[PDB]
Structure 1
């Protein structure tokens, strides 16, 4: 999609981190960001969590693009990223691999994962390594705030989690 970056309705947590209680698919469609972040795995298999939602919204175009990327380039590393099409959601999708602590992956790589955001002026993003990836979402938000130095607009879907997360910044 042509970029518009129509961001509104966010709470400002820090100079550069904004957060909203939102479905990232519905938010991406309304914002048309330059970059939407996917909570990816190294083979870009878009199943549970944010990844399946973004892919479903593209009617599997993201998965077919991702399979072709993997065929040519092979898998990412944990903490790594690649830039692919944003399809109908964004100009670009930055597929970022946070460590999956459910799979015994090194939580220290969450810093590396969030560093990928710093390659981009502005992003719409979910929390990395939490949810199906098994890390504490409070820790994910802390690493995001400490590591991301560019303009990041966070969407958190679950209202109860959103309220608990933002409580410590109000």
Structure 2
């Protein structure tokens, strides 16, 4: 048993809810929250900007030190950093950004990072301002992630479309 509440079960391991991932993280304090990161860990907008704002910019300060030491992530890659006030850990995962012309085939590689963690609170990778079709992102998630993933979908309209179109 875990602390996640109000989710619809899609598969053996994937669950979904209409929720603001920031408010969900604050309530649950999951072991792992996933950030929709870019390779520079510049948390300006979308999910990343919202998570970072909720940490009072401490996520950005930590991220800047990580990049100064290690250089940028790969598209499809990830790093584990602090979860600050939101979670034990934040898994920063870089899905391809369609609005930058990145290969959508990298979305599967991005979701493979989730398999290193038994349970995660996550957004749909490459959705929102990353430009991919969220229906596609949910299909890749279900067909790639084998660990237990709790998906938070901010937009109620999109949530209802994801559920009602799910195969």
Report the TM-score when normalising by structure 2.
Answer: 0.98
Give the count of matched residue pairs. Answer: 167
Q: Spell out, residue by residue over 1:60-106, the C-alpha distance to the aligned partner (whole angstroms, 9 max, x if none).
A: 00000000000001100000000000000000000000000110000
Given the alignment of the two structures, is residue 134 of structure 1 paired with residue 131 of structure 2, yes or no?
Answer: yes
Q: Spell out, residue by residue over 1:119-158, the C-alpha distance to the aligned partner (whole angstroms, 9 max, x if none).
A: 0000000000111000000000000010000000000000
Tell me the CA shift for residue 168 of structure 1. Answer: 2.6
CA spacing shift, 1:84–1:92, aligned 2, 3 Å: same
Q: Distance in 2 between matches of 1:89 and 1:76?
A: 22
Aligned with 1:105: secondary structure?
coil
Aligned with 2:81: secondary structure?
strand
Unpaired segments of 5 or more residues in structure 1? none
Aligned with 2:41: secondary structure?
coil
Give the match for residue 149 of structure 1: 146
Are the aligned partners of 1:6 and 1:30 in contact in 2 as well (CA < 8 Å)?
no
Q: Spell out, residue by residue over 1:34-62, the C-alpha distance to the aligned partner (whole angstroms, 9 max, x if none).
A: 00000000000001110000000000000
Alignment of 1:43-58 (within 5 A): 43-58=40-55
Are the aligned partners of 1:5 and 1:32 in contact in 2 as well (CA < 8 Å)?
no
Q: Distance in 2 between matches of 1:81 and 1:5?
A: 25
Q: Distance in 2 between matches of 1:79 and 1:45?
A: 16
Unpaired segments of 5 or more residues in structure 2? none
Alignment RMSD, CA only?
A: 1.2
CA spacing shift, 1:84–1:5, aligned 2, 3 Å: farther
Q: Distance in 1 between matches of 2:70 and 2:129?
A: 26
Give the match for residue 22 of structure 1: 19
Are the aligned partners of 1:5 and 1:31 in contact in 2 as well (CA < 8 Å)?
no
Report the TM-score when normalising by structure 1.
Answer: 0.96
Q: Distance in 2 between matches of 1:90 and 1:130?
A: 22
Aligned with 1:89: secondary structure?
coil
Q: Distance in 2 between matches of 1:5 and 1:114?
A: 22
Given the alignment of the two structures, is residue 63 of structure 1 paired with residue 60 of structure 2, yes or no?
Answer: yes
Q: Distance in 1 between matches of 2:113 and 2:70?
A: 18
